[PDB]
Design a protein around this nucleic acid. Structure first.
Ligand SMILES: *P(=O)(O)OP(=O)(O)OP(=O)(O)OC[C@H]1O[C@@H](N2CN(C)c3c2nc(N)[nH]c3=O)[C@H](O)[C@@H]1O
Ligand SMILES: C[S@@+](CC[C@H](N)C(=O)[O-])C[C@H]1O[C@@H](n2cnc3c(N)ncnc32)[C@H](O)[C@@H]1O
Length: 405
RNA sequence: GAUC
């Protein structure tokens, strides 16, 4: 693979969206036969329903190169190969916060100043902005929003307890009156597992009780966990986390509200079916990878604007699917479809975009993967432009180049 | 995925 034939690094990013959905929202009746249960599948290599066989195989052999390469020795080449590496978290708690700084700019203040379809803001600067942040420890996403909105925003967060819990005291700004954590059933005493029906309903009730029963203006979800030793099966291993995050959106996001969620590879029809559901439920959806997302990984984001009225059937349906997933844990079964492949493919415009997205992200990732590998086999190579690139990105995004401590 |  020739990685040196990649486009020049740049602060400028382009975005294209899915076509706006014209078909009606699926109801309970229509979806009554949509859930397919079959053998649990831990193989990814043949998932070519929305991606060319060459591209899928190339990005997997490119990942698997590092199966025998030293992990630290690999991340040191990664640090050198990635032109956007030096940005890091600037004065925030992690680099994840700068992803929201990155994307809030690109999507025209969609999150810090949410509008409706007509161009009218949802919140009067001279009212209060409500947001939710799920699967979110230590809290970088909320750190950005709170730092940007001060006391004009109130955030509700749920994440897994443990070493990766929220770190309020480390927020550059914020306080307990700006950001209020809730861990599911039991409240502050829950575990924050978003994949539990109890926690789901509980956090939903909580968010509604504090948003005039309207829900939040937007939701951000950035869920992930270690897939060490079996990295290639990352999409499958986190299939449920993805579903629960899409579901949480349909559960607490107000009408006309927004939603941004981290996904990984989207080769399986299970994942693609989920996006299709978001596409039916929101006024406009796109798949985007910001430059603050490392170019060799399968990380991208799905950005959703304007929640449609009457999405409750889809909400109930997905809550129901999640329950089956909990029931099929440690068994040889699994939910492999949430929307029939014929229905997804029935929409040519959706499918055309979805395929084109998968492929353009594969080719970029392959090069970056090949790039890291080259930076392993040669430690003198480097991007001499990291400093100047970082500088323009902060200028562009309106992030002051000041320091944390 | 975050961190080291
Ligand atoms: P993130 O964990 O999804 O990815 P990250 O930004 O942290 O980059 P990194 O893990 O270091 O590597 C990028 C992609 O390659 C896969 N890896 C990592 N890794 C150590 C490893 C991978 N793949 C195989 N086949 N074998 C390996 O030992 C990551 O999951 C990313 O997709
Ligand atoms: C790396 S973080 C994202 C970073 C975060 N957005 C930030 O800016 O700090 C991913 C989080 O998802 C959480 N997570 C994974 N599985 C979860 C689950 N089933 N329920 C709740 N949180 C989960 C992890 O604990 C982890 O904290």
């Amino acid at each position: 693979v020739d990685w040196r034939d990649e486009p020049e690094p740049s602060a400028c990013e382009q975005v294209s969206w899915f076509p706006e959905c014209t078909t009606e929202i699926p109801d309970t009746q229509e979806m009554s036969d949509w859930m397919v249960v079959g053998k649990r599948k831990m193989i990814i290599e043949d998932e070519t329903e929305f991606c060319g066989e060459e591209l899928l195989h190339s990005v997997l052999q490119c990942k698997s190169v590092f199966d025998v390469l030293d992990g630290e020795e690999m991340r040191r080449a990664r640090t050198r190969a990635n032109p956007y590496e030096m940005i890091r978290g600037v004065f925030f708690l992690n680099r994840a916060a700068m992803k929201m700084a990155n994307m809030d700019f690109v999507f025209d203040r969609m999150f810090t100043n949410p509008r409706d379809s007509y161009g009218k803001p949802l919140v009067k600067d001279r009212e209060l902005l409500y947001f939710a942040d799920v699967c979110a420890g230590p809290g970088g996403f909320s750190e950005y929003v709170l730092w940007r909105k001060k006391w004009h925003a109130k955030g509700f967060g749920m994440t897994l307890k443990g070493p990766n819990d929220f770190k309020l005291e480390d927020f550059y700004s914020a306080s307990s009156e700006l950001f209020e954590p809730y861990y599911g059933e039991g409240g502050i005493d829950g575990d924050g597992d978003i994949t539990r029906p109890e926690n789901i309903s509980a956090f939903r009730n909580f968010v509604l009780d504090n948003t005039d029963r309207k829900g939040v203006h937007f939701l951000m979800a950035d869920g992930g966990f270690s897939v060490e030793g079996q990295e290639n099966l990352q999409e499958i291993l986190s299939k449920q986390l993805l579903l629960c995050q899409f579901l949480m959106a349909l559960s607490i996001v107000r009408t006309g509200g927004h939603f941004i969620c981290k996904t990984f590879d989207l080769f399986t029809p299970f994942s693609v079916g989920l996006v299709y559901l978001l596409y039916c439920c929101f006024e406009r959806v796109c798949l985007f990878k910001p430059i603050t997302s490392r170019p060799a990984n399968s990380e991208r984001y799905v950005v959703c604007k304007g929640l449609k009225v009457g999405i409750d059937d889809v909400r109930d349906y997905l809550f129901a699917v999640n329950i089956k997933l909990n029931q099929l844990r440690n068994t040889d079964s699994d939910v492999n479809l949430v929307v029939p492949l014929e229905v997804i493919k029935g929409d040519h415009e959706f499918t055309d975009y979805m395929i084109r997205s998968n492929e353009s992200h594969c080719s970029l990732q392959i090069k970056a993967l090949a790039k890291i590998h080259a930076f392993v086999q040669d430690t003198t190579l480097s991007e001499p432009r990291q400093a100047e690139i970082r500088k323009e990105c902060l200028r562009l995004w309106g992030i002051p180049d000041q320091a944390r401590v």
